């Protein structure tokens, strides 16, 4: 049957703070079927500098993927809020979003 | 030219802790070429309950991927140390490993 995606945001590693840009991660797991859309935003505006892995088949027959938004380290360190949004047929209202920031 | 993988371990989200199993994440980014191997270990033994994404082309022409190890929450809460190891031609010794624990 359809299975609802679980969406978890994961902050950049402390070790990435030596770089000019850092990685904001959105883990989307346990979803079926594989058809899905994932996007990023901040302050209500689209954040386009991201890449998302293809869905990967898990052992339970569901799928997972990760989406990675790359941002200027200063935007992350200065407490900006980002959010990953997911569209999938097994989500209530077919939509959910999760926020990611140092300030949360 | 070849480009050295950056390897970052990320702990489970606080929101995953309501589950019986949690996800440990290994981000491997900025590597070139795409040929790479990634494995997991704990307390000096191989951990096999993981899946790794294929390499994905980044805007700068290098690749990134993620590996996800699923472990019992109890094992993570008990302080067990886990590590992601990466083999790639652009690493010193063609090998590195990064640890992750509570």
From Swiss-Prot, chain A:
Region listing for CH3, in residue ranges: 1-104
Taxonomic superkingdom: Eukaryota
Disulfide bonds: 26-84
Residue intervals of the Ig-like domain: 5-101
Task performed by this protein: Constant region of immunoglobulin heavy chains. Immunoglobulins, also known as antibodies, are membrane-bound or secreted glycoproteins produced by B lymphocytes. In the recognition phase of humoral immunity, the membrane-bound immunoglobulins serve as receptors which, upon binding of a specific antigen, trigger the clonal expansion and differentiation of B lymphocytes into immunoglobulins-secreting plasma cells. Secreted immunoglobulins mediate the effector phase of humoral immunity, which results in the elimination of bound antigens.
Quaternary structure (record): Immunoglobulins are composed of two identical heavy chains and two identical light chains; disulfide-linked.
Record-given protein name: Immunoglobulin heavy constant gamma 4
Species this chain originates from: Homo sapiens (Human)
């Amino acid at each position: 049957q359809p299975r609802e995606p679980q969406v978890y945001t994961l902050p950049p590693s402390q070790e990435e703070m030596t770089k000019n840009q850092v990685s904001l991660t959105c883990l989307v797991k346990g979803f079926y079927p594989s058809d899905i859309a994932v996007e990023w935003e901040s302050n209500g505006q689209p954040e386009n500098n991201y890449k998302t892995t293809p869905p990967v088949l898990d052992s339970d027959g569901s799928f997972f993927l990760y989406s990675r938004l790359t941002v200027d380290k200063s935007r992350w360190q200065e407490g900006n809020v980002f959010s990953c949004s997911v569209m999938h047929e097994a989500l209530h209202n077919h939509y959910t979003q999760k926020s990611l920031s140092l300030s949360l």
